[PDB]
Write a protein that binds this ligand. Sequence first.
Ligand code: MG
Ligand code: MG
Ligand code: MG
Ligand code: MG
Ligand code: MG
Ligand code: MG
Ligand code: MG
Ligand code: MG
Ligand code: MG
Ligand code: MG
Ligand code: MG
Ligand code: MG
Ligand code: MG
Ligand code: MG
Ligand code: MG
Ligand code: MG
Ligand code: MG
Ligand code: MG
Ligand code: MG
Ligand code: MG
Ligand code: MG
Ligand code: MG
Ligand code: MG
Ligand code: MG
Ligand code: MG
Ligand code: MG
Ligand code: MG
Ligand code: MG
Ligand code: MG
Ligand code: MG
Ligand code: MG
Ligand code: MG
Ligand code: MG
Ligand code: MG
Ligand code: MG
Ligand code: MG
Ligand code: MG
Ligand code: MG
Ligand code: MG
Ligand code: MG
Ligand code: MG
Ligand code: MG
Ligand code: MG
Ligand code: MG
Ligand code: MG
Ligand code: MG
Ligand code: MG
Ligand code: MG
Ligand code: MG
Ligand code: MG
Ligand code: MG
Ligand code: MG
Ligand code: MG
Ligand code: MG
Ligand code: MG
Ligand code: MG
Ligand code: MG
Ligand code: MG
Ligand code: MG
Ligand code: MG
Ligand code: MG
Ligand code: MG
Ligand code: MG
Ligand code: MG
Ligand code: MG
Ligand code: MG
Ligand code: MG
Ligand code: MG
Ligand code: MG
Ligand code: MG
Ligand code: MG
Ligand code: MG
Ligand code: MG
Ligand code: MG
Ligand code: MG
Ligand code: MG
Ligand code: MG
Ligand code: MG
Ligand code: MG
Ligand code: MG
Ligand code: MG
Ligand code: ZN
Lengths: 52, 83, 239, 50
Amino acid sequence: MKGTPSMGKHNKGKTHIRCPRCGRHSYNVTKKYCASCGWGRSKRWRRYNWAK
Amino acid sequence: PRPAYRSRSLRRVKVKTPGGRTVVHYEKRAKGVPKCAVTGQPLGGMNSKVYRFGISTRAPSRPYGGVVSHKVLARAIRYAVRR
Amino acid sequence: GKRILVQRRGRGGSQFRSPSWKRDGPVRYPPNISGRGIVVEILHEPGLNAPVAKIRMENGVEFFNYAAEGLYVGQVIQVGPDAPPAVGNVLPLGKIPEGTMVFNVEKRFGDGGKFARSGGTYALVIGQRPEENKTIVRLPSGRVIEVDARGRATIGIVAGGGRVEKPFVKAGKKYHRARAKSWKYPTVRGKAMSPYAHPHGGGSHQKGGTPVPKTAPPGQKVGFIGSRCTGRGCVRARA
Amino acid sequence: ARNKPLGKKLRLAAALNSNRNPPLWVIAKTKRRVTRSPARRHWRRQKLKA
RNA sequence: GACGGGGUUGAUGGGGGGGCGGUGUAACCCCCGAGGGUUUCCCGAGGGGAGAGCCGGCCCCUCCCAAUCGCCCGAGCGUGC
RNA sequence: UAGUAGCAGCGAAGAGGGGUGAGAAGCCCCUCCGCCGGAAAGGACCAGGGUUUCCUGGCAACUUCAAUAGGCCAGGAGUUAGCCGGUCCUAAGGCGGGGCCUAAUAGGCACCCGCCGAAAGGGAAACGGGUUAAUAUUCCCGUGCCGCGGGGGUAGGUUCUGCGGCAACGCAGGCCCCGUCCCCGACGCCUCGGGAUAGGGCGGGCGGGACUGCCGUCCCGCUUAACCGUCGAAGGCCGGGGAGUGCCGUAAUGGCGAGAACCGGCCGAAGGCGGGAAUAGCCGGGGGUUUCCCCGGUCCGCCCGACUCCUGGGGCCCGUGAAAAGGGGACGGGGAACGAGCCCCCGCGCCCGUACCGAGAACCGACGCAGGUGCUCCUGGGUGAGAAGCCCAAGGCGGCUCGGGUGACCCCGGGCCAGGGAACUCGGCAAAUUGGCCCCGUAACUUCGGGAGAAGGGGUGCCUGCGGUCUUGGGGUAUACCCCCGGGACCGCAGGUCGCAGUGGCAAGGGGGACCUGACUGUUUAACAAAAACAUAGGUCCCCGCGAGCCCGUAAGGGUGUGUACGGGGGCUGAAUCCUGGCCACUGGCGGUACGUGAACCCCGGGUACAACCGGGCGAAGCGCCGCUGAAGGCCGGGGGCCCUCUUAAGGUAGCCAAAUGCCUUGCCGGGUAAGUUCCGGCGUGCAUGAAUGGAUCAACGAGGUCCCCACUGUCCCGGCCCGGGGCCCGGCGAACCCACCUCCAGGUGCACAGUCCUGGGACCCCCGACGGGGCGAGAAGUCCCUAUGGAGCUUCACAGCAGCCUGUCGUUGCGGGUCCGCUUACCCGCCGCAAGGCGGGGACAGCGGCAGGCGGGCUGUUCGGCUGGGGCGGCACA
RNA sequence: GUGAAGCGGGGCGAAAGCCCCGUGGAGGCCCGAAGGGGUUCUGAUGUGCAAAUCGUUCCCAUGACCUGGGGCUAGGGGCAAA
RNA sequence: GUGGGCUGGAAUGCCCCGCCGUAGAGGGUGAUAGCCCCGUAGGCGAAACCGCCCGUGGCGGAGUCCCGGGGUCCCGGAGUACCUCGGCUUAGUUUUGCCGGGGGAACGCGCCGGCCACUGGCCGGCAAGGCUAAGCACGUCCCGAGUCCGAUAGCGCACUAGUACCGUGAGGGAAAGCUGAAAAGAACCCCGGAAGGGGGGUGAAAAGAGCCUGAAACCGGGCGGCUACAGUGGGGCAGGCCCGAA
RNA sequence: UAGGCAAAGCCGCCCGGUGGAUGGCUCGGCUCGGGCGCCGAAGAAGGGCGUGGCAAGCUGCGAUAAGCCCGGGGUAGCCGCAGGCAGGCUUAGAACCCGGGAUCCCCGAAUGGGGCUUCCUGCCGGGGCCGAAUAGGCCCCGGCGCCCCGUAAGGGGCGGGAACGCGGGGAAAGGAAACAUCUUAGUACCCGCAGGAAGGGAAGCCAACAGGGACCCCCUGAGUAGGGGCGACCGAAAGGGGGAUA
Ligand SMILES: [Mg+2]
Ligand SMILES: [Mg+2]
Ligand SMILES: [Mg+2]
Ligand SMILES: [Mg+2]
Ligand SMILES: [Mg+2]
Ligand SMILES: [Mg+2]
Ligand SMILES: [Mg+2]
Ligand SMILES: [Mg+2]
Ligand SMILES: [Mg+2]
Ligand SMILES: [Mg+2]
Ligand SMILES: [Mg+2]
Ligand SMILES: [Mg+2]
Ligand SMILES: [Mg+2]
Ligand SMILES: [Mg+2]
Ligand SMILES: [Mg+2]
Ligand SMILES: [Mg+2]
Ligand SMILES: [Mg+2]
Ligand SMILES: [Mg+2]
Ligand SMILES: [Mg+2]
Ligand SMILES: [Mg+2]
Ligand SMILES: [Mg+2]
Ligand SMILES: [Mg+2]
Ligand SMILES: [Mg+2]
Ligand SMILES: [Mg+2]
Ligand SMILES: [Mg+2]
Ligand SMILES: [Mg+2]
Ligand SMILES: [Mg+2]
Ligand SMILES: [Mg+2]
Ligand SMILES: [Mg+2]
Ligand SMILES: [Mg+2]
Ligand SMILES: [Mg+2]
Ligand SMILES: [Mg+2]
Ligand SMILES: [Mg+2]
Ligand SMILES: [Mg+2]
Ligand SMILES: [Mg+2]
Ligand SMILES: [Mg+2]
Ligand SMILES: [Mg+2]
Ligand SMILES: [Mg+2]
Ligand SMILES: [Mg+2]
Ligand SMILES: [Mg+2]
Ligand SMILES: [Mg+2]
Ligand SMILES: [Mg+2]
Ligand SMILES: [Mg+2]
Ligand SMILES: [Mg+2]
Ligand SMILES: [Mg+2]
Ligand SMILES: [Mg+2]
Ligand SMILES: [Mg+2]
Ligand SMILES: [Mg+2]
Ligand SMILES: [Mg+2]
Ligand SMILES: [Mg+2]
Ligand SMILES: [Mg+2]
Ligand SMILES: [Mg+2]
Ligand SMILES: [Mg+2]
Ligand SMILES: [Mg+2]
Ligand SMILES: [Mg+2]
Ligand SMILES: [Mg+2]
Ligand SMILES: [Mg+2]
Ligand SMILES: [Mg+2]
Ligand SMILES: [Mg+2]
Ligand SMILES: [Mg+2]
Ligand SMILES: [Mg+2]
Ligand SMILES: [Mg+2]
Ligand SMILES: [Mg+2]
Ligand SMILES: [Mg+2]
Ligand SMILES: [Mg+2]
Ligand SMILES: [Mg+2]
Ligand SMILES: [Mg+2]
Ligand SMILES: [Mg+2]
Ligand SMILES: [Mg+2]
Ligand SMILES: [Mg+2]
Ligand SMILES: [Mg+2]
Ligand SMILES: [Mg+2]
Ligand SMILES: [Mg+2]
Ligand SMILES: [Mg+2]
Ligand SMILES: [Mg+2]
Ligand SMILES: [Mg+2]
Ligand SMILES: [Mg+2]
Ligand SMILES: [Mg+2]
Ligand SMILES: [Mg+2]
Ligand SMILES: [Mg+2]
Ligand SMILES: [Mg+2]
Ligand SMILES: [Zn+2]
């Protein structure tokens, strides 16, 4: 059930929406901050040195 | 508004129109009537069906009106006259 | 991963917490009640172990107390040092005569009541030691303690006694009770798990554990925890 | 969805405005060098993450 | 694919007529029918008589229709031991 | 490979004629045929999708085939709101500022403040008809409603109060501001009486339609929104009354001097009816033109009736079934001289959503995917217990997007099969039997509930009459009974009669005996395990009096806890019933006077111009030692004479057994079979059974594992024939696996199992179908096994280490009096307070930081050698 | 479908009581659609319709029941009728 | 120099004749250009904005400046120096720096350092307060260079590349250059439903917009050899048929 | 007997189809050297959305939207990549380049408050509109963040930048042929904070009785002393020569 049948349940929900600061589809609506730029939890822009 | 009609919060009323169609009208349920502050029973004179807030209801012509029943008022007055 | 169930409880996850929003309020003495009041309601409170009385004082202050057995709606109760030791009255402990059954006993004045609050329980006033403002009471467990003589207790026994004598005949019945409480229901035995999940988990013939010392760290301190003894011999030595 | 927020609706509008191939006179002007647009998409295949 | 039969100088398939066979007695008509009602000329499940009726990837007979019009394959010559 | 597989299977499908067009089985129109119809299919619609919607045009690509079609392509267009939703409110919860914590933050949050948090909860106000290619409670017509504000009139007011009624309560009930209180908002599940409406039906009427062999039947229309008014069943209440020879009742429980009957009244649903409103809509008949006008009907009388709406009664809970915005009322305080909740009239109502799909082609699954999401919410007639199945409406579909021919084998899915009846097989697997309803009847056992649909026997269609029990209206003196007429439900009797078959299709239990096992319902390895595993109610033990116990956090602090021993936490056992033996040696835990040992600090001595350094003293927990503890982890044998005795303590009790536990072993004796390694019943020095490590134990229950019996059958003897789809052939689309090259047979040889080498034997070559013997066939760097000075996870009596807890010490640590007493102001704990600070308790303790010892697989890192007729055990052939 | 507590009537009887019939409507009750689950054929499929499906036969189906939306718990950590 | 002749569609090439050079770095132009053009050597230049340097100007202070004498009076940096314990670190070793717990100075007649501690001598200094140009690191960016690569290379990207696109997300991420000197981009006729085909044109050449060259695998056609009584590939010898121009 | 003489099939060459190798080309890359060096509440960087007559992307720009004004350079053409169809602009001096201005939507430190949708919404002050109205409602413009300095007026910090710099927190893999001290490494990475550079810098110094004379960076001292299961391996300083000099 974990494969194709369970993919059927990804048709209606969401974890992220578009972020007003960076524009990516990365704003976690439940956590209320952006997974990409950190908007909503960090006034500084999130970017780590381990990322190229 | 469709899941809102799947809940039973509104009455489902089936009605025929002058055009010959049978439709469903989703209508509000009645609000609860005023109750006695002591016994919790509905107060006389104010237990008419009301379907929205903001409608003035006339209380009976008695001290403390639509707050307690006549039975509670009379007993409380009897206690105070003695005391 | 590897943290055992007792260790996960302390994180305060939803499945371990008390749904206290299901109740009207804490059952405790307010700090400044005095005079006469009226029992205006007697209510079932979800998750509690006794019926609760709503009391209205003359100055309009309302508070919840556990209902004394025999208390009735409309009864006039008295609060304070001048109150006679009648059932439902709230008295300072230094004023309660010896040999009196009391409940909801404060340990220090103003803590709201700490002891003998479950249904059917009571505390006995054993003695008075007023030269240091202490009252001696026997608690439901049989332990004898000293309490602040200025603290408050209620006269009588807690209502709702005998609840536990009737069996919870089905699993479903305890399930509904647990949902009003904080208990995790149901429980899995330690020896029914694999070793990563419990000290008792594991072997081909699973076994319980011998007692751990009081100094054992969390995650090790399960089973018998620094027990004085176990079995029927411990009960016999207890007596 | 039937009930849209305007901000999402305006991003959908932008994708609708951009979803089209270069005009035929652009193909002529560039000697058939420009014939496709990267914004060209089909509603069933290339999904917007709107 | 092949094989076998016929191909108008012909009964090869169909049609039509006949034989033989399967099922079970159609329609119409006449009689009986427990009982009831516009009283005994109506209703009524059903039974009987005469007639079977339907059907055949089988046989015979009969040119009525169709086996037509057509499209192809095909040896032929040299040389040496 | 190969013009090959697939384009079958999941219970629908096409055909004729015409038109368009270069071209038509497939596009458009009609006719015929079929499928759904409580729905893979009709009606609505959330999320998600985002233009897929609509119009015009088109066919390079796209659609498992075709195409003139299209969710495709090109061009154009389309979504209209005070009353529909958002918006507002709070829920579980979340975020931000302050503060506290932090090396620090973008990390934490008990506290203070604010805000966010529901397109299914709460919550202002719109309905009907018409219109478009495409929007429709949004546009248009008609008729309204809500909020806020204003004008006029009126009641009322203008020191002071509204009037009526015994009362319940009734009635236009003045105006502005402020406060407080109460109520509504505001609530579960089960069950049963009552009232309606939607819908359905029957008889008559008017209009229209269907059919033609006979009859004359069959079908359709006959509708009525929101809103205004009025009426109001149950229930509750008021007045009179004043009852025990009782009296009044219900579907059921029942009610009454704690006030019954009875009489009169008050408040009071859904909904009815009038107004709206026939002028609309519908049906029928006409005339226009571009959707307009005219004419006729739109009726009479009954019945059923919800899953929709309303109401009341009863029961259940160790379960009690949200909150707030908002609203209503009352009770008060203040102000003005005016002025309403009534009537007429005027004004204003922003912002965002609104197309379409909503799924066997618009969502997710790479797809136009038999899955998943959503059958989420709704559904007419006949049969029927039924929202079952089957058939048919309303409405839709023939697009679960290949067509045709043939009628070999073989495969998949179905039907039937003489005689026998489990002889098949690990095994009755599969198949078959049984099957509904009514009557009669029903055993052992049992926890007295059950077992039970036990088992077993009988009946069942159609037709013709005659009855009964009710129900619903109307008419009879007529509220029940009785008579007459119309409709509805259910039950019975007599007679006639047909079939092989009457629960005739559809639908629809095979049954019985016994053992093991888990009491039961429940849960589980998403993708090989559904179980005897987990859980469970019940039993029992332990830690704990709350400033606790246990747990989380670096900390601030937190969970249990809005709690308090009838409680929180931690083990083990696993319903009930009869029971639960002996053992404290071991491994643990806990308690303990003395003694030995036991760290840092400290003290004394030596040493050092000072130190380093050396010796001693004191000595906490702990350990040693002594005790307790088995419903702690568990253990329960010999020898000797009920007694003694040995080994790490005791020496297997009650019971139970070749056990899911017995090797020997197909144990021995019975049962059952013609024949029984399984099964059942007994036996028991039992390799190696046994008591909450649970023993014994089967009532009830079982998709548990097993044996026997009846019935039954294509399981078999033993195979045959038939049906649908694959198959085969034709048309169209058109892959993949695999592939050094590519291989007739025999006997040898060879890295010991050759297509290719040797010696023989054969073969005219090519093509089709089939199969699965070979190609050590294809798939996958073998998981088995070993090796590597490779991992991971888990364990502990491994080597180490770190937290956590306990214990001493240094500091916090102050003040009086003689190591002791006291004190409070430090510090800690709780209450009140916004804070300031107050109250109470503890108190130089505790708590906290550093240092030191102990316990410490709770957690971290690692090591777990080699040789070896494979590894392992052994040995050391390792010096 | 069964028919607990409770409540009527009748019969036997000396008392207690016992028996029959009815009423009543309890239950992690029973048969069985929807819905949920996933036992068998070790059926079909197994370059699939599908990287877990389909048919058939089954288990539960008033409750420890099934299901939408919102919320909380995060990696040596969570959550676990295990 | 756009000079004469030749080839060529077109010359920057070849032959002959001239010229500049402080300029023969390099590029473009119908093929290879010192002199055709841009440029190069070299020289000149800014309304406005910005930067650097120089001269000059305005002002403020308590003599704070230079030299000599006198002093022996006053000042001169604290939880610091130092001791001890734990820990991180350092080459720092009985001896580096620091942090934390505990203890904790002196004062110029003093204090600190001189590789274990102390004592004496000698030598060197004045911690525990603050600032400081220049000379040094880097590459988003600008300029220059090159025994670097040349479209599967070189940055992932020579191009409508951090793009299309993939994942809930953190993140991940391609393929893809070339007509010709000039469009002279194929008129016109016939056929086809159309894509298109034939004829006929343009050009030096179809190089034809699917555009330079156009390999192999692979497939079609033609030609040579073999082909249904003979088991395959490779080598040598002998022969048949076919090719054998350079 | 062989030839005429041929099936399916095999080999070779030529032509064609397919394919896109090779070769040539290069407005791209890479490496090295030199320069230059901060932007932001006067609202940045980044993002979203819009913007062209026919315009989808890129580029530019911001409702004044491939652009507006002034000046200088540049003279006759122009309307970006981008070779089309139109219509215009420009000798009253355009295009283009350089300097200075104007405009500059929404989100963004984002700063009135929210934000599950880059959009919504409050109060106050001023203005406009609907309206009989001065009511009521609707709309427009401006102010309204936190923490601070300052008597106040007023002022400051916040976010970004390819790398480089300063302070703190801080591994493991691997190596040692196992492994723990150790190393890897004060590295990766994380948190904080600056500048065009940062940090350092003016003797409680180094030396040895002879004398140097702030600091940083380069060459050396030197893999020396020293640390280290004294193993693997780690590793200075003074002094000397320079850059520069305060
Ligand atoms: Mg998974
Ligand atoms: Mg979520
Ligand atoms: Mg709602
Ligand atoms: Mg409601
Ligand atoms: Mg709970
Ligand atoms: Mg297990
Ligand atoms: Mg463990
Ligand atoms: Mg342990
Ligand atoms: Mg164990
Ligand atoms: Mg999709
Ligand atoms: Mg096939
Ligand atoms: Mg069907
Ligand atoms: Mg079809
Ligand atoms: Mg049908
Ligand atoms: Mg049905
Ligand atoms: Mg549907
Ligand atoms: Mg369409
Ligand atoms: Mg169309
Ligand atoms: Mg399209
Ligand atoms: Mg809100
Ligand atoms: Mg529509
Ligand atoms: Mg009728
Ligand atoms: Mg009843
Ligand atoms: Mg719509
Ligand atoms: Mg399909
Ligand atoms: Mg129809
Ligand atoms: Mg076919
Ligand atoms: Mg048979
Ligand atoms: Mg047999
Ligand atoms: Mg056999
Ligand atoms: Mg079976
Ligand atoms: Mg059937
Ligand atoms: Mg079980
Ligand atoms: Mg499984
Ligand atoms: Mg399974
Ligand atoms: Mg169990
Ligand atoms: Mg028990
Ligand atoms: Mg035990
Ligand atoms: Mg025991
Ligand atoms: Mg025994
Ligand atoms: Mg037994
Ligand atoms: Mg035995
Ligand atoms: Mg057995
Ligand atoms: Mg034993
Ligand atoms: Mg056991
Ligand atoms: Mg045992
Ligand atoms: Mg047992
Ligand atoms: Mg079960
Ligand atoms: Mg051999
Ligand atoms: Mg081979
Ligand atoms: Mg074959
Ligand atoms: Mg291998
Ligand atoms: Mg492997
Ligand atoms: Mg080795
Ligand atoms: Mg202390
Ligand atoms: Mg301590
Ligand atoms: Mg370990
Ligand atoms: Mg070893
Ligand atoms: Mg070995
Ligand atoms: Mg060995
Ligand atoms: Mg049940
Ligand atoms: Mg299986
Ligand atoms: Mg199978
Ligand atoms: Mg297959
Ligand atoms: Mg069932
Ligand atoms: Mg020149
Ligand atoms: Mg100094
Ligand atoms: Mg590249
Ligand atoms: Mg190339
Ligand atoms: Mg070419
Ligand atoms: Mg030659
Ligand atoms: Mg040939
Ligand atoms: Mg920008
Ligand atoms: Mg903001
Ligand atoms: Mg900054
Ligand atoms: Mg490395
Ligand atoms: Mg190593
Ligand atoms: Mg290793
Ligand atoms: Mg500098
Ligand atoms: Mg500096
Ligand atoms: Mg180092
Ligand atoms: Zn963001």
